Amino acid sequence: KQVRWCAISDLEQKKCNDLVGSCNVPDITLVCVLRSSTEDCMTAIKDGQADAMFLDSGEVYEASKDPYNLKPIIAEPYSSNRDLQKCLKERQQALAKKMIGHYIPQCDEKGNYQPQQCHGSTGHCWCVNAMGEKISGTNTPPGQTRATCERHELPKCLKERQVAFVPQCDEKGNYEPQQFHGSTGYSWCVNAIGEEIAGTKTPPGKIPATCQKHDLVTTCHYAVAMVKKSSAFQFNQLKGKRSCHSGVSKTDGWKALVTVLVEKKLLSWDGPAKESIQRAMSKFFSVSCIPGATQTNLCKQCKGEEGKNCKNSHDEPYYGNYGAFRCLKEDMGDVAFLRSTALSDEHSEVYELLCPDNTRKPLNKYKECNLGTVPAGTVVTRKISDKTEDINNFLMEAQKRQCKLFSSAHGKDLMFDDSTLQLALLSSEVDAFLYLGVKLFHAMKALTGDAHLPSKNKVRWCTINKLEKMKCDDWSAVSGGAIACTEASCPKGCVKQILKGEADAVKLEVQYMYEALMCGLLPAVEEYHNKDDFGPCKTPGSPITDFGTLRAVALVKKSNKDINWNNIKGKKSCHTGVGDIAGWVIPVSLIRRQNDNSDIDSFFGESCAPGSDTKSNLCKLCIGDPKNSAANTKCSLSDKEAYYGNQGAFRCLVEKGDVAFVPHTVVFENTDGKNPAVWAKNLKSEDFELLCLDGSRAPVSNYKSCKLSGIPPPAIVTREESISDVVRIVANQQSLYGRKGFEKDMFQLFSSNKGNNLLFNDNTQCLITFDRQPKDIMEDYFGKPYYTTVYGASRSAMSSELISACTIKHCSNSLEVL
């Protein structure tokens, strides 16, 4: 019902009052809280005196910590080569605007851009490639012959696959990051457009380089150094010069420049633990105006009034990009460090750029004469997110109602970057780390001084609950400084901690694996479950007969002789639950692979898949709670189902089913006398059969050959610089607290008085160092069958915030490169 925005200057508050008066959003009132600087506004938000504010990307990492503890919530979205049905989304967003006479993208039947796009109110038309970009030169006014529009929707990867080394592309048609030559056995990594990145080519037999995912994006902004053409100094002569900066905490004003100076060996400084950055910089420049700085000489050139001088605020006239430009123009500085948004051609007469290659270039080449790419700013609120909903509602309704958000007659870049086109809500999961990405986050961390000092003799294990934490603390007490503990909420959070340099290793089930391997983490060791062969564990290296991995299988009655694999469409199927690998994942994957219509809600009839829609066919014959008429619990992902799990899905094949999808063990777990005492009394393991791929059958004890696929074992993961460490520290720790370890009376790695299946599954036999075969990482852990069947042998089969954070954003002028 009310949203308080924090303004850092008088001009920002004037724009805020303007928007209070003009922008009428129903049921949400706007309020302007005035503070004197950026930091004061952050504090006011932390104190609940205000609700949200805009921040530069560089100010984000320090905002997520004490004494602010803020999180990003609303950012500007970038166009990329990963967007799907972009025309439909853009058309919807345009139709949602409360205005008339604006361009509403025209879509065809299939959700693709019409090659010709017209602006209705003006009569202008133009041509457009698949991603909506205007083909240069095709804008035609009314009354003039329209440019004939071709259909530019063939991607470059598919255009290269034809006329043919044959690359591998994904379902949409982009480049797979890992490329493998079929003629000459080799492996390398490629760009977002197919360019081979140097230093990655690998002859066969050798392990291949770990390739990283690339997204091609447009409209990137950069940090630049600007100098008047009359001056004659270069980059490595900055020492002693007078500088103008946008702000002490901005990326375009401070942080990128510092990273460059350090890499260029120009800044006399070693580490942030013994001397702050501002000291070294104050000794580097003579006099400067760097808003927010605490060194006297770094504020001499500023022109703010008494008390307003050198603040992170427009009250300081030299604050911001345009403030630094004004500082350079009035000759209060020799070089201005700012963003490529303040660039204009009206300035290309007097001003030029100053490249880190000790050369000068005109403004228009800012793409090749810069200090780094600068991500867009973000709206931030309290990490507790008590007001995210209201802020998002107000901002998006103001965008629909065409309020003057990203412009003002009072000044430039007030409240928001004036270069902002549209603001969109981020996932609630996104914090500073997920927003900045792994690389940029680690860079911010190393710059602020929180860089962790790696220990090659201590592994920090991550726990997912308090019971795991208690077992970890027992292990750490009996460990002798080799095992430490960290706390997280879910395995995904542990992977985040590992990538943030706050933890070292963690055991992941296969379901969490695809993301982990996608972010550069490798398997150090794996969980052995073969209850019958302790050979490979007592002498580390003795060959492995079988790993004890689960085998997903389809189990049927010998009574129903007609059910074969090539006719499973329509039969009552049985699933352990929506999410389980053997009970749900493998079958639906193989189905959408072999039957191209790929509809599983209609493929089966009256299946029991606990976890699907209560009204669909996937929740019939699901007897929910036999003796509980006080609650309807049918089709639930809990034991309140009489069909959840291996046992519950086995009840289905004997009751009202024709086929079940379970691990192979279930048949031997509830038959042949070793069964509970209700429904599987006189049932034997001979009365059942398995379904194989070629459409035949076999006895149950053929799960090695008549199998759907193989389930990869749970794996302990860590970073590549810790493998050789973690492995050995595991080995040392396994000869002491394993099953046949020396001090098994002190502690067991595979049992606990605090709970069951903590840290590792209780039926685990031992841990084995993951051998790194010379092939793809996913193909090595998952195995070619599982990989190809579930993920389609692709690195684009999944999209989450974490993979988006492990992504290199390849900047380009446009996606027209096809």
Swiss-Prot record:
Protein name, per record: Saxiphilin
Domain Thyroglobulin type-1 residues, every copy: 84-149, 154-211
Keyword set, alphabetical order: Disulfide bond, Repeat, Secreted, Signal
Reported function: Binds specifically to the neurotoxin saxitoxin. Its physiological role may be to transport or sequester an endogenous organic molecule other than Fe(3+). It may participate in a detoxification mechanism for neutralizing a microbial toxin.
Start and end residues of each Transferrin-like domain: 3-83, 212-449, 459-795
SMART domains reported in the protein's UniProt record: TR_FER, TY
Tissue: Plasma. Highest levels of transcripts found in the liver, the lung, the pancreas and the brain.
Record organism: Aquarana catesbeiana
